[PDB]
From a paper:
Heat shock factor 1 ([name]) and 2 (HSF2) play distinct but overlapping regulatory roles in maintaining cellular proteostasis or mediating cell differentiation and development. Upon activation, both HSFs trimerize and bind to heat shock elements (HSEs) present in the promoter region of target genes. HSFs recognize and bind HSEs through the DBD, which is the most conserved and only structurally characterized domain. Here, we present co-crystal structures of human [name] and HSF2 trimers bound to DNA, which reveal a triangular arrangement of the three DNA-binding domains (DBDs) with protein-protein interactions largely mediated by the wing domain.
Crystallization of the [name] trimer in complex with the same three-site [name] was unsuccessful until longer sticky-ended DNA duplexes were attempted. Two structures containing 23- and 24-bp oligonucleotides were determined and refined at 2.4 and 2.36 Å. Different from the HSF2 structure, two [name] trimers bound to two intact HSEs reside in the asymmetric unit in both structures, where the DNA duplexes were stacked in a head-to-head manner. As a consequence, the two [name] trimers are differently oriented with a large rotation angle between them, but little conformational discrepancies exist among all the [name]-[name] copies present in both structures. Like HSF2, Arg117 (corresponding to Arg109 in HSF2) in the middle DBD (DBD II) also inserts into the major groove and forms a direct hydrogen bond with the nucleobase 5′ to TTC. For example, in the structure comprising 23-bp DNA, the C terminus of DBD II in the first trimer is rigidified by a close contact between Lys118 and the phosphate backbone of DNA but not in the other two DBDs. In contrast, such an electrostatic contact is observed in multiple DBDs in the other structure containing 24-bp DNA. Apart from a purine with an imino nitrogen participating in the contact, the amino nitrogen outside the pyrimidine ring in cytosine may also engage in an indirect hydrogen bond, which, however, is only present in the structure of [name] bound to 24-bp DNA that shows more pronounced DNA bending than the other [name] structure. Based on these observations, we reason that cytosine is a less favorable nucleobase than a purine at this position because its amino nitrogen is barely positioned at an indirect hydrogen bonding distance with the Asn residue only in a context with sufficient DNA backbone distortion. By contrast, in both [name] trimer-binding structures, dramatic bending occurs at both the 5′-proximal [name] triplet and the downstream dinucleotide, although relatively smaller bending occurs at the 3′-proximal nGAAn repeat bound by DBD III.
Numbering used by the authors:
A (entry chain B): 14 to 90, 95 to 119
B (entry chain C): 14 to 82, 95 to 119
C (entry chain A): 14 to 83, 96 to 119
Amino acid sequence: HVPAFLTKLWTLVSDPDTDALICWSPSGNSFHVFDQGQFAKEVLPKYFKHNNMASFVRQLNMYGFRKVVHIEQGGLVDDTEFQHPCFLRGQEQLLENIKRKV
Amino acid sequence: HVPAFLTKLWTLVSDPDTDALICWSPSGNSFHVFDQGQFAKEVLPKYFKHNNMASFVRQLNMYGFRKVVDDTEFQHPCFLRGQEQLLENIKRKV
Amino acid sequence: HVPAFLTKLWTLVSDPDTDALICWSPSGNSFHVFDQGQFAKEVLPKYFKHNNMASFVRQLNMYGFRKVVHDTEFQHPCFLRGQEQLLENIKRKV
DNA sequence: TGTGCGTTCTAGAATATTCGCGAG
DNA sequence: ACTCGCGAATATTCTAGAACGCAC
Ligand code: NA
């Protein structure tokens, strides 16, 4: 029913063993990826058939996720945050409302 | 969605800790940059991918700011102290 | 007249310091990137205003580079070891 | 028995940065 | 000769197109 990408992403974010690399934000309305390098090489191949952050990012955009911009990035002086309105901590059933672009 | 340049400009002008280098005018309808040299060298690279005052000014003109005729003053009709919601009306040129 | 990206890219690839992360292929008609995590974190910000491999890859495509399918290998016919003069022919997409 | 999903490589679109022109 | 808005090329970021394999 719910496509594999969303259930794995939900499980991956919620899993407390991965919270050093991917976890919910305190509000539970977005998720963070820390150290993209270790995440792509260590975490992604355990759920998907690849280890590329770009292929994970491409899927995020296919399901309508958007990157959250922090106002402190953009200067010359690793935290990647994504959000979807129906991807909320404690609301796994809401994943049926997220559906992929055709 | 309000572009990063205006949000950063609003934060930088409004911030009282930076007022020795960039701050609102007393009326709050314009802002001043003092000592452009130290501002470009020390403040800009903490917010933008450069330390060039010309590139900051170029963006000011891109968003329709104009210079009011060291001490450099710039103005935009929708860049007003206490009216942060008006940044939504500032649009980049075509 | 040669854009900064091509001169910097030729320089960083040719640099024997970085050959552990980015170097020419034996034939010298393509270049390899090993461990892009460390390449993006340490090499890119020394030449560009960022440390994202995606922003490096995007520029490679804007200049007509192509990824060769088999760590990470890219090629352009006018990007050859010892022929910095051929970069003159690599022209950026509109 | 066609359609939706996943992975990869490249391009689109908006804003950002640089350089130098020219009206006044 | 000089100031100050520009145009234009390139740079950076985030999202999408397109091709192909796979499943049901
Ligand atoms: Na200030």
